[PDB]
Design a protein around this ligand. Structure first.
Ligand SMILES: Nc1nc2c(ncn2[C@@H]2O[C@H](COP(=O)(O)OP(=O)(O)NP(=O)(O)O)[C@@H](O)[C@H]2O)c(=O)[nH]1
Ligand SMILES: C[C@H](NC(=O)c1ccccc1/N=C\c1c(O)ccc2ccccc12)c1ccccc1
Ligand SMILES: [Mg+2]
Lengths: 164, 310
């Protein structure tokens, strides 16, 4: 059974923990408890093979980013469609990963989280799609940790990218 | 920014980093508050300190990082191991004092998944002795939980190889007995998936697994290491299991259940120097002595868990 080191990155409050806990444990985290560093393990089936995911749920700010990026095989870059600042911050993370990895060929997915908060949307779906295209046709999903939309697909897509 | 932190592990190898607000003087109580647990989730669990050959449940007042610091001295006091192989880690695990009656109360999905993960760890390590039937039921529930719904096309033939069997049967049964169970496991697996009366909610399937574990004699046991001498005088390394049900001896090598005694059916006596304890099986003409530098801890826990029954 192949091991996959996945890293969930993004600014404070975007729902990195919520997405990870929903995927791994099938629970929605209501309380906002700022993460220091949490690691989760989950066996999944992707393309007819059993995969052991090690998911690193990171802090919204710094510490061990360069280390996470050196060790990590795949990266979920999460913003909240509710908070423009969290979308703006992801450019720096994208560039940092490519720098540390020293290649543009890095398994990565852009995730617009909290898509259940349609009314409170500050960042448009098209603006998300626009950013992903700019990132060398990067994978893109709008997700909800609460509604359980495209939660599993975030982690499945990274495993598929690592396998190529 | 210059704050100290510690990783609290679970049996699956996952961890949560917790800020140490008082450095190495931070208590179990303060660390437990630092976890992402409600009081509904928290009351069933506590911090353990564990290396490969010694596991201790810590109390709310204990300072876990000082136990990490003093681990070589603790090993020297409680064991005959060499400290080179043992750097300890901190774990969130079931409180050994948790009554089975209270655990049967639990509806909280997070509490259930933590108890489930720990139960599965003990099953796969071979610390649960149960008939082939019980083990096959547990194996079927792990297939539903881990692999999802049975599909003839995926699971019928050439699926339950040793790789897949390793994750659903005890390591003690994997090579010899498990291969003959494969058809009976898959049958119960199919029966689960195609039964619309059996909830496929994760916490429901996990509670079903636990339900089957609650009837196992050693369930929720704290394990200690010792030796017994046979009556010519062959040394047998043993695990001493103490839980809310009673005392259990496993052969250390094979994990075979040598004896299981319920509270009210046996008495204990602590040796003069906490290096051994004697068990007398009330109305069973049977007596044995376990040699262990953990003898003091074993009797202390027997007294607490026996005393807990009212
Ligand atoms: N409605 C809704 N709320 C969400 C969603 N995802 C997260 N939240 C909420 O947003 C808050 C922050 O979520 P959390 O996972 O802690 O964010 P984080 O990115 O892990 N924060 P940090 O970087 O500090 O660790 C919580 O109150 C959580 O319930 C979502 O998809 N929908
Ligand atoms: C861990 C042990 N002490 C206790 O936890 C302790 C606390 C109060 C009463 C009695 C105790 N000793 C038995 C145990 C128990 O009651 C409950 C659970 C246990 C689990 C595993 C092993 C033992 C015990 C210790 C050892 C070395 C240095 C400090 C502390
Ligand atoms: Mg978080």
């Amino acid at each position: 059974m192949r091991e996959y080191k996945l890293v969930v990155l993004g600014s404070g409050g975007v729902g990195k923990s919520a997405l990870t806990v929903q995927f791994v444990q099938g629970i929605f985290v209501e309380k906002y408890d700022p993460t220091i560093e949490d690691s989760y393990r989950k066996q999944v089936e992707v393309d007819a093979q059993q995969c052991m995911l090690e998911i690193l749920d990171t802090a919204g700010t710094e510490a061990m980013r360069d280390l996470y990026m050196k060790n990590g095989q795949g990266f979920a870059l999460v913003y909240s469609i509710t908070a423009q600042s969290t979308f703006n911050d992801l450019q720096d993370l994208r560039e940092q990963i490519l720098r540390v990895k020293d290649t543009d060929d890095v398994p990565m997915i852009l995730v617009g989280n909290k898509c259940d908060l349609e009314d409170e949307r500050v960042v448009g779906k098209e603006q998300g799609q626009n950013l992903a295209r700019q990132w060398n046709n990067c994978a893109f999903l709008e997700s909800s940790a609460k509604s359980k939309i495209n939660v599993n697909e975030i982690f499945y897509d990274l495993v598929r990218q690592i396998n190529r | 920014k210059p704050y100290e932190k510690v990783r609290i592990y679970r049996m699956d190898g996952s961890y949560r980093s917790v800020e140490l607000k008082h450095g190495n003087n931070t208590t179990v109580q303060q660390i437990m508050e630092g976890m992402r647990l409600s009081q509904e989730t928290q009351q069933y669990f506590t911090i353990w300190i564990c290396s490969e050959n010694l596991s201790l449940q810590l109390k709310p007042y204990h300072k876990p990082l000082q136990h990490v610091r003093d681990w070589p001295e603790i090993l020297a006091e409680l064991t005959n191991l060499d400290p080179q192989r043992e750097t300890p880690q901190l774990f969130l695990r079931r409180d050994v004092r948790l009554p089975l009656e209270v655990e049967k109360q639990i509806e909280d999905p997070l509490a259930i998944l933590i108890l489930f993960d720990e139960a599965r760890y003990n099953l796969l390590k071979g610390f649960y002795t149960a008939p082939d039937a019980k083990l096959i039921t547990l194996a079927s529930l792990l297939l539903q939980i881990v692999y999802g719904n049975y599909e003839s096309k995926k699971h019928k033939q050439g699926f339950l190889n040793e790789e897949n069997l390793k994750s659903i049967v005890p390591v003690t049964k994997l090579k010899s007995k498990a291969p003959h169970w494969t058809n009976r496991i898959l049958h119960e697996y199919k029966n689960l998936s195609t039964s619309e009366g059996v909830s496929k909610e994760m916490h429901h399937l996990q509670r079903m697994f636990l339900q089957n574990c609650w009837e196992i004699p050693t369930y929720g046991a704290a394990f200690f290491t010792g030796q017994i001498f046979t009556k010519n005088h062959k040394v047998i390394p043993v695990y001493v299991g103490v839980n809310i049900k009673g005392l259990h001896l496993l052969n250390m090598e094979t994990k075979a259940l040598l004896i299981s005694l319920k509270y009210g059916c046996f008495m204990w006596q602590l040796g003069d120097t906490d290096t051994c304890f004697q068990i007398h099986s009330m109305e069973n003409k049977m007596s044995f002595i376990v040699h262990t530098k953990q003898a003091g801890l074993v009797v202390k826990l027997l007294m607490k868990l026996n005393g807990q029954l009212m």
